[model samples]
Target: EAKLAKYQADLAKYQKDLADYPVKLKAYEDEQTSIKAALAELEKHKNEDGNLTEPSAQNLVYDLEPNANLSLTTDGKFLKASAVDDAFSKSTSKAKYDQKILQLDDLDITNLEQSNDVASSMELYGNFGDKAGWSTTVSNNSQVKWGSVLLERGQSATATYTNLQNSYCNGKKISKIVYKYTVDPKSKFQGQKVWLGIFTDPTLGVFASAYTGQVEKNTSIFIKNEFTFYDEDGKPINFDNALLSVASLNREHNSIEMAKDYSGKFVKISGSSIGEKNGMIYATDTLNFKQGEGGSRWTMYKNSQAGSGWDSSDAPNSWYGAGAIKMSGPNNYVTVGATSATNVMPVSDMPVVPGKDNTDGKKPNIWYSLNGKIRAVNVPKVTKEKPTPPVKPT
Candidate 1:
């Protein structure tokens, strides 16, 4: 009994140390691991006081997503949400090739309406209904009954992908799914919160899915449309087996929509900023002089802070993506700033000395989308109690 009590007390102290200074995670883990193994043996008999649960293990099995195991201690104590997410982001390896990061051009985007209603407001946003290769359906059980409808506060749009064997992901299962698109880029929604999730089940399930945290919206929801797939060391599982689904809960507190009326299609060019010497471009960000196209942008944003000396037509190339840009191809670009869609200039304005021998590399960061805008919707408050109508009637 004395030894067992000491073990529990020691376990608690180690946990505090881990929680306090996660920077020394390796040291903490080393000590914690030893104690947890021993504690497991000692407390193996106490079925209720802290019986091992498999939330993380079960989630990993059901979701086929890695890092779930990393989010829990051996004894089944769940890590903090912030820590779990940080680890997941940091440890997941990057895609080997650009092809790993799928794009909207790779899949069909559809809008589905309510079961009974023929008219849906969501259709105004985009061609979100059944197309030739893919079909979409709204939720049959929700109170709102909006399947792919663009929703407002407290609303969500659920979508399913069928006949994906006919798309680019034909034989591939989605190890990672990202719903990358932009809403309004106005400053009002600079910090609006949103979320997205993808599932293997064509039926909109959630045992496991590539889900975004309570991610704050800036210009776009997900950037580059690629998420690190960490299952079986980031290998393709083909788990969906041709059926997949997704849901976006962006209408939490704002009403954002695509800026179709905005003239000029907004696009991004991702590459390391290169310099031109003797009419030959080379990546200047790297120590070596690698030949590439001279890259320049109109908007320059440092993180979420909008860059200065630029307006709608001449936004400077901002620093939205992390790391330096990798000069890839003429079309290899992502967003640069968190400015409004109105400020996102046309790609033509992005000055790049057209040259050859350039290989595309991604300078990744959550950049803004020029294709959308967001605004807060006002909900009128109803006076629940009628004015004290009648003491005079008595």
Candidate 2:
């Protein structure tokens, strides 16, 4: 009984201390915090109530997958950005790329008709600085159509080469497919002549016809003349092969069309430009010769064929070739030597016949035929759309 009384006193004294225990614990925690903070240099990571240090960036990943294995450098830097960069590695066609970047905006928001296409328009204001103006209907000659109608990319490949014609021809007996384009001074094809053809020669490997002309720096639609399909009989193209696909080769960059309406002909060059204009499709008596002839000196038709008594007259007038596709003005060299053509070549030496040698100086012109099927008649109308401008308002 007497021992029990002593035990009760000891319990009462210890009870107060037990209740006050957290005070020391809090003091200890503050001390440890200061100690820990002073012990390390700005660490953020912690484990089980204490700071931990770097292991490496790879140790930071959950999983590196999907497209490829990937991780940051030990210090969290990208070595290759692996999977991220790989996503953009595929080459998006440059043509489409230009449309999005160059011609998409600046288009009149009010004057649009979106569809298989997207465009806008705007009326004019008399108070404006220019001509005051007139209601203009502007629209991008755009299409969702792959490539242009002038020519589709990648010929038809199948059990027979004729498949190429059936696929590309849309039933036109395709005699000629002509187009002009400037090689991207930056492509693997710069300054190179490309051959366009539908080919079949088991000796040359099946469908060995990669004679497609690359549309470089410019988009040039091809023009067609429905003549007998010419093939050289599996040799060059015997004109008699079972498979005769239309081809446009850069092979003879300089050669005479020899047929008809040569100057009056031009393959429609449809492409996305920064806006409604770049250089004039045909500025008042001027042209930017991106690909072929210049007007300095061409005889027009100064050569004679043994049969037709071919002619060249009136100083520069005697030369032949449906006349020139280019003309500076009503008074500037019309109806004469390299007088005009959307694109052309005057003989470099003497007669000034169609020939190639940029070093010899041949500038380009436009035939401006709308569909490859139609022949270019009058000159294509051209003007800058000031509404969309760096302001070359004329």
Candidate 3:
């Protein structure tokens, strides 16, 4: 009777332990979940703090050098500056401009013609207020405009221009005028090619000779005498004895062109308007041409390495040249993809390792081998235990 009683007591104890095991496991799992959630929140905040916002607001400073001795190519297509060439040739010269084919400073005002009237000059100054930074004071007869124009960092200046009125028995007109403006200090205007664009009414042909300037502001002024314009059909229109320069046909492309007939004839050229692109203003009237064996033409040349061959199996060549010419197709060019090298790696090129033989001494056990692995381990049968009652107030 005593042994049976003892077995009954043991069975009751086991039942109580079994019931409490699930509650204990649940508590442990809850603690782990809380810890994981805390770690995830911390990681998220860390990533957010490192993210870039308002990237453009950061102040960036660039070193600018005087690029004198700047001249256009013989065909007037490319810009050539001895200062840049010298700086690049010498290893000691720390000056370097950004590597861009189209640069803002490359474009220049070849010709600019202003009205002889003082009021007209004042209006012209006002129109260029943003670029010139001049304040105007216009009275009845005498008008003066003066202010500092900020050209670059660590550079600014004040310029003064006045219009003098002449009064006679016949009539009063603005007869004498003095205008002067300073170039940015340490600028590359000296011995450099200068271009000016002058605006005048279409009716008054006399205003055609108004735009004149020196190669540099300090040099003797030369008058330009050629003008070129484009008709509605995109054909070149030339004026007799008029100065001409290159201008962009469209604002979006930011393309440039040079005056064909007036090449090297004048130091500068004039046009109605200029278009802004890539932080520079390109003349809208100019039509830049590509130099070819048969004179200059308005077309871009395709290089050899750009998949330009006629035959599918043979090496590629450009149509601009005679050999292996291919007919232009709608989707001739290949699209550029991501620059990452890892993304370019093919699956077949991955590194391979030799698999271990089944008889090898170092091979894994049969139960642990990849295909020879056995099913899951046999779990021991568990007997249920009775739950313990909650402790009541005593």
Candidate 4:
């Protein structure tokens, strides 16, 4: 009888333990469900903008006073109320090219001008002052005279003389004038040169292009220093060391078509500048040189494709031009000056003419001015809060 009683007691204890286990598990499950619901409610409110209202208040299941709240601002102004809500909900389309450098491509060239006609009155600008000695000229009788036996360091000369011959020199119009110069040791007198060819034929409009070639010779007399390189013998090669037989290589070529169909079209020219506004976009600054039966000599403006088909009776103010050039390629250039849309251009994969502008002396060769408006948008941030357990009945 005693053994039977003991067995009954043990069985009762086992059953009680099992019952308590289920109750504990049920309490844990209930707590987990409450946490999940609280989290969902918090998430819904987190995405909402503006101040919270009493009707929208949720159980304070979690505390995140140390956490940061997401806020929205535009153009230095903080957005509030419905303004914030709408901005957060709306989808934003990005600006096509922001802070991106672009190279002048074939399409941009073709759309600028159509003709290749060169003219005689077309005067070429050289690195030197405005003296006639600094210009390239082709005689009416079909002869070419290149001025200034050599281009100074970082100086540029225009291919305008060649263009003039093609436009109105004589029956023998020159299609192009290929500049042939030997690269000296100094590298400046040699082929480390850049030429800006401007076509002035009104029938052809204005077309500009640049070319840079490698310097092969060694002329250090001006700088009083010599460059050192290795010879085939692996011996130290000095600048005076025999003509280092380096061949000239054309690094880059940029040309804008000067045809009537492309007249008034905007073409962005990009390059590095030494001025405060270097590495930016620029529109052609046109100057009318002649007034003919059709139109003025040349037109200039801040924008492309602006003024076209104006009557002779119309004044210069009536002529409209593009202020900024469109960049269509990669942003391979560096921003050295103020950050503006106009002060950007692709890095020169080739050599460049380094000097101040001949006309204004204010602009540097590699520097550019921003003439267009820049567009930018801010990005959004997301946040989530953790949930806490509820209090027991008091």
Candidate 5:
């Protein structure tokens, strides 16, 4: 949990720095531009005879060094000054500005994997555990069940599973997910605290988890985590991985621990960055794209991820380069089953998101043949709810 939190917090701070950096960079560039313009204006003061005309002390007072070597006529209307390059080359402010550029260049930002083991675990166990046929193993005074668990101090339980065979969303683009857990709080902190570490498929060689940080004994409440999916290019991608595990940390405060360190790759970005996947250069902060020929391209940001005012702004498309959109509370992510047919909607109503546009009034060679109209791909069919007839009044 700490590792994930630190990584996420550092990522946020890095982005904020990038967003704020442009202002500072522009200021420095403006200062340099101003200096160059002032120098050009000073150089324009040459008399028609090709000799320089001396300006009053006003310009030189702020623009030149106090110890500057120059000659001026007693009338103060003629002068010989040092070379422009020589003057600025020794400028104190210019030296400092150059140093500032180096400082900015040294700033580092880590590139986190968009899809991680921790998140994949949450998706596997929290949602697909049942069909995956995984059993919960308990120890000490712990109790484990399909949907809930109970643990006493110095006790633990684990449910090991995978999603390879039972995934309903395996090859699908999952725009959003929600994981809900209920904390009984009957035994309370059980010494110091009871934590839930949900681990999924491994990344590189390390396993990561969606941790419940630490839960106090007195808080009996429902926990909810919502995660929205995106790619490095900010496009939606199909799900990955199948394995998962739920580990229990019910021991004394310092007796057992989830390791706190992990390796992360770093990336340097200026303003915004482009990523290459396969062999294509993909754009970030974008949800939809016109592949060949398409009209009325729209993006789907789930109500939870999009917020209430999503209709007004593209704030929902602000995935940046992160693989998932996380909520602001202390929790973890996994999949939530779409239990009822009521939530499914037909794809026919939505405007075409063309994957290829061939406007020659002919069939496109690269696009799927949909007669003349293109509908969304991989959209589930809407199930019509049976209407209840009016009840008879007896």
Candidate 6:
């Protein structure tokens, strides 16, 4: 009978391993994609003189090793995802977009608009449902004009849906984003407008959007972001960026290639929910917080990371930290002639993300300087009680 028995210790390990599966699988997909792309370049075969014929992608298959240790870029086509490090971080400078920078290059508006289709829903075992929780304004889209990511600072965007519910949004928490070009720490946004009024105008419909966090300094990562019941004609929402995770809070800016790779792509939005403004109704994409209509904003998933638009549960947040994007702003109308805007989102430190996923690496175990490593700061061992000063000192 021992032969048929399953041990608890073994079971625990099994789940642990299983938990890391997505991360590992994503690695494979991303790595495989690179290999395939490299092989495709060989298509340039027939040297300049057209006298030589290089090998095709198939020729390298023999040497391919799916079990080998390797890393992969998201969407590269997993083969054997990158190795897992309990602590790892990525970095980026100011936001910039162009062939040389990572400014939504691969973005295809048409495809992005339809990314949540049933066909692609096959990712992460079908967890990558429709939109990233928040939907487009059905008007001022993600792009400055449906093809661009540029927008003036003063300009605001809103999500298509409101008052998240299990039945309505499926999951109020913004799960995916794409074509987002962001900055480090959201330290600053493109300043073009002058007023900061709430974008809630019944006559104008709904202006909305949702996104993940990137950088942080002081912060309490809150739930999926919250809100509900307006205050002073505006919705007030608060966020604690540091509370989320080193991966999210310190998440650096995007790479020059990332923007290009996911340009206009209906991808997952990186960062956390930056809380509601003016006692806002929702976290722009969350249900409600402890003080509003709901008791809780959004519960934390075992694995964080904005996740792939192809599928939410496909990869591990620890192995690879996600990036940013403007899910969609209702109507990005600005200073009359100020047609374009740069402030894709409000300047925020981001909200807090409670809980933790240590063993699995949902969040990095340690922090680092962006130039040095993933985001920055070290994960302290413990917060010791301050030593009581001797009465003599008094």
Who wins the TM-score comparison?
1
Per-residue alpha-carbon lDDT of model 4 for 305-379, expressed as tens digits? 433322121223221211122222111111111111111232232222234121221111121111111110010
For 17-55, candidate 5 gives per-residue lDDT tens digits of 667666655664565566456546644543322111321
Candidate 3 lDDT by residue in tens digits, 1-394? 7977777776676667667767855664664565456444544443232111111110101111111111111111111222222222232211211221211122222211112211211122211323233221111122212111112212212112112121110011212211111121222223233221111111101110011122222112122222222323433322222111121211111112111111222211111123223322222222222323112222233244333221111122111111100111111111000011112123233222234121111100000000000111110111112233443221
Cα-based lDDT at residue 317, candidate 4 = 27
Single out the weakest 10-residue window by summed lDDT for candidate 5: 363-372
Off by over 4 Å in 1: 1-26, 29-64, 67-104, 111-291, 294-342, 345-349, 353-394
State every prediction's TM-score relative to the real structure.
0.21, 0.18, 0.14, 0.15, 0.16, 0.18
lDDT of 1: 0.23
lDDT of 4 at 169: 12
- Report the C-alpha displacement of residue 241, candidate 3, in angstroms: 27
- Model 6 off-target regions past 4 Å? 1-150, 167-313, 317-394
Clashes of 1: 35
Cα error of candidate 5 at position 215, Å: 11
Write down the worst ten-residue block by lDDT for model 6.
Answer: 79-88
Task: Tell how far residue 159 is off in model 5, in angstroms.
Answer: 3.1
| Candidate 5, lDDT over the whole model | 0.22
Q: Write model 6 residue lDDT over 1-394, tens digit each, in one string.
A: 4733555556666667667666655664665666566556644542322111332221100111112111111221111101000000112211321112222211111221221221211111100123222222222122111111112332222222232221101012221111111211232212221111111111121111111122212211111111121212233222111111111221211100011111111112223322223222112332122222222222323334233221111223321232222122221111111000112222232223344111111110111101001111111111111222222110
lDDT of 1 by residue, 103-147 (tens): 211111111111232222222111122222222222211111111
Strongest candidate by lDDT? 1
